Design a protein around this ligand. Sequence first.
Ligand code: ZN
Ligand code: ZN
Ligand code: ZN
Lengths: 199, 194, 199, 159, 235, 161
Amino acid sequence: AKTMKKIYVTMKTLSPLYTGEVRREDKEAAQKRVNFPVRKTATNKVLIPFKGALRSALEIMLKAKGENVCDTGESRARPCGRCVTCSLFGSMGRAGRASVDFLISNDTKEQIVRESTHLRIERQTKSASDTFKGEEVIEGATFTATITISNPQEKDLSLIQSALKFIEENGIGGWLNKGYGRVSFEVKSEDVATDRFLK
Amino acid sequence: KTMKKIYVTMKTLSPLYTGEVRREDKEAAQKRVNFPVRKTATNKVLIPFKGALRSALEIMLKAKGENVCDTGESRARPCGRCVTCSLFGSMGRAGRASVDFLISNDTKEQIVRESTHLRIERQTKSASDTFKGEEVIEGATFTATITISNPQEKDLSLIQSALKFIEENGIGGWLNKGYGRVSFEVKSEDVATD
Amino acid sequence: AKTMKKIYVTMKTLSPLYTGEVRREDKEAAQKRVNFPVRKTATNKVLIPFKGALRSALEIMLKAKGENVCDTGESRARPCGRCVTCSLFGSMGRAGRASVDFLISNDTKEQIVRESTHLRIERQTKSASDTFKGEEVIEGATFTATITISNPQEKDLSLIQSALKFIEENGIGGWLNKGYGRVSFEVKSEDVATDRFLK
Amino acid sequence: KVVLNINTDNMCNFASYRLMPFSGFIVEKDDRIEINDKNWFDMIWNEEYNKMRSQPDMSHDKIIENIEYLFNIKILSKNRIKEFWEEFCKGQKAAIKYITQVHRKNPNTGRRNWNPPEGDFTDNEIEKLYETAYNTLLSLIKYDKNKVYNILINFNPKL
Amino acid sequence: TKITFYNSVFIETHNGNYLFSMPDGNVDYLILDELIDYIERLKYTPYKVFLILAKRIISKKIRVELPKKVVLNINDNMCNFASYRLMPFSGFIVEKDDRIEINDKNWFDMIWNEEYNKMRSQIVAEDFSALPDMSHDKIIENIEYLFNIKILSKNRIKEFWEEFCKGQKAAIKYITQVHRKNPNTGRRNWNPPEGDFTDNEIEKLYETAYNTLLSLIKYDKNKVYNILINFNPKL
Amino acid sequence: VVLNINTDNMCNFASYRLMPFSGFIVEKDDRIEINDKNWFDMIWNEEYNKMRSQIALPDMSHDKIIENIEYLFNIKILSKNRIKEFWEEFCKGQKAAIKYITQVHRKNPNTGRRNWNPPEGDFTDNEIEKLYETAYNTLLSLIKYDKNKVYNILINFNPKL
Ligand SMILES: [Zn+2]
Ligand SMILES: [Zn+2]
Ligand SMILES: [Zn+2]
């Protein structure tokens, strides 16, 4: 109420990282060169969606405990509005308490994005059957985000860290089964007064 | 007498979305994008700016200690006594600040892109629902001009405080998933004689 | 979905190992000095793709056994979704249940990567006709991966271990017909709960 | 004058001096011998490279049968119809160019850029289906825009 | 973990029978005059005692200790000087992702040479800054013939275009390097022509490739790109 | 800022004049100096001498140097292996380069053989010995010049060294 919990999350990549470009025009311009462009700014810095990864982590883990969290991931499935995940990240008619920012890179695309050759090899002949260039983010690339919890509760920070420990195990972004997206999160939280700027 | 003028240039730091209010243009765009971005017919992006500055000063001043009138509530009818109703509006007298829409400097073809947003299942880990929403690219320079008549001493500082609250929470929509984080650069001017 | 099988995989090289650099800028910069660069992280560690090797292993073994397994690997082939390899590794609908991480070294390129001279020898003259240089990974180099099976079935570790034996017998990546890539695997299988992180 | 554009934050202290090894580019100007980093040269290499580079006939009732078949054995898809419709709206010539590009069998691999048929087809039936796709879309070239849109709108409702 | 309490917490793991401060069992680590007898009372004298007192208990033939990533030294001739065994060593600690190596000057000299070779071999003279003459059709004819037979390949056309973007001089440098007949081997870096031939004919097609590529560097970039894009569609 | 680097070997990349470099930003009292590897070798000898303590090269002109290196490269004395190993000893310090050229030129007192590669072609024994002494004098004059100009001189005869 009178405080906000600001979780400054700094994430390093322990693996090549791919998250796909969403922007039609940028993707269409890049498919002249690379069939799988990476999601960037016009400031030329890599953007990663972060709220949905945290929500997916907490729904799978809190449903694995047996708590009555809903699933906001099926087709047509609506948030119920009574879970701890619905309180932390939102419901239809109830805005989320966590203002999860995008994972914005510290470096620019020339430093951390590399165009990479990926293949499909025929099983019998052991020869290349398909080739495709795709952009990926290098290892050791640092990304920063801020998760700003409004109306702070007790569990929240630990919940976020627990969700981060899910993303440290599985990954963030795309091509997660192939080995991509393995990352390491470091947390620096701070409880701050919501009237910090009025002075 | 001397009305206070605040030129507010805004630079987009994470992709911006503000949904389109006009039903006919939204219906025209619904074919290409499920969520069209709020656009002028001069092919420029306008952003609502009064309500975010208001709600910034509402939550900051409410938890500060100065009692205010919670607008955007179930009934949301404000008083004519507290500080926000003396700045951003009251149910009786006009608000002392005229907050222009954050018009863009650039055009639709230079900042506005359509994007694939997604909903992924948590067991199959595949896209359940896909939709196409429009955003504004980062580094896009918008401009607005706040007009505080009858200037009190705690006016420019309060507007700057609200802009810092907007720089950390965001302007527009889809604010919790990371859309809307921006920076604000501010210049001020009193005008006396014409 | 309550459990999660973590297969920690430790691979020691019994032969020289090569896997080519896929990153265009890094390949070109290394091709100013060595004609066949080995695949490398930005943290100077050696990265073999591992999901495709396991999937190819299981596809030839399960096609030999006479099972209902399709052939991802043929040019732009569509996974059916009804095999066991589509369950463990993915289809166009559901993703793979096993998140196969890259086989990352515990060592750095200074310690394990050597530049080696390879030849083409004319048959009648018995002299060197062509010469090239290739980066390879030394014998006894130890690589690690962690396969993470979500919704673990009972025949999942057995198939992973069978694929590990097939990768031991055919080689992991690179010039497998010349003698490169002969490796050995150690399997630290476990079964963790999904709510391990939630405290 | 000398300006160090390299970041000065991280610096060890060996032999009682604050020293730091760097690997950068000493660059000339009108009067500024400036030390600019690796990223600066990636800026100018990208800038200079991008600057120097930046400077037949068939029945409509048979056509409907062909696009149905080639949409049911997955040679023709929503993406193919989408790019076909964009290239049709940019002209006749560029759409023939796109259909040529997709049908072009590379002599090195013998691979065309279509999507492979699923099902137990052998070699020359797949080749005949590729030829069918070529002649069907290239017969659709000469038709007028309204008829091509009504033909394609059954298969890809977005375009 | 077998724990027993005495008038003293005697945890008995498999990594040592620790005891924070006398049981009759074997005690491995004693987490500790009056003090000396307590140690003398223990049968099977402890390996280490975790404490003036230390001087004496060292002379009682007993080890003491007085109150992250693995550190590996790579640097080993030491000396007795000032009692403790010791050597002067100046070096470099490096912080790897799972370890901390302690390297010396030869490692830094090695990586200095390895970085200097990368630095010096990145800019080659007038990057992005007397050619023979040929008609445009003759360039089309010879590049088409030397693309059918495998001399001018897609990789050769690509690497021609990349160096010709970097100027005319770098393109002449690349073409002279590819055409160069090494005096020790008698071989050019052209990919050999496919089809049955004769060494005079092969040498003349190599000369034809040299003259047709050299006559193309005098042409305008857009004209060079529109000649080569019919062969290598990427560049 | 005080550059302790000779500002030569500067190519013209587009509308820019520049020089690839690797050195040390040794921030000191108000200098923030830019010193090369030779200063770091001095500094390492400073430390590895001080810490232990607690316990005439000829001038031959540059064009004559290219001329002599070219002549010796075509008569198979200064081969590519010799240029490569000279570069490896030159990057290891000038003293190691004096040691290497002395080791290669040393006529062994018993055998009477130098460690150069023999001249290919008809040359008399006195002429062969004068060519060997020319190799010693030319590479010994190349030891004086700085690392960048020696890289430019040696890259036109050995493209990978
Ligand atoms: Zn819910
Ligand atoms: Zn009020
Ligand atoms: Zn299948």
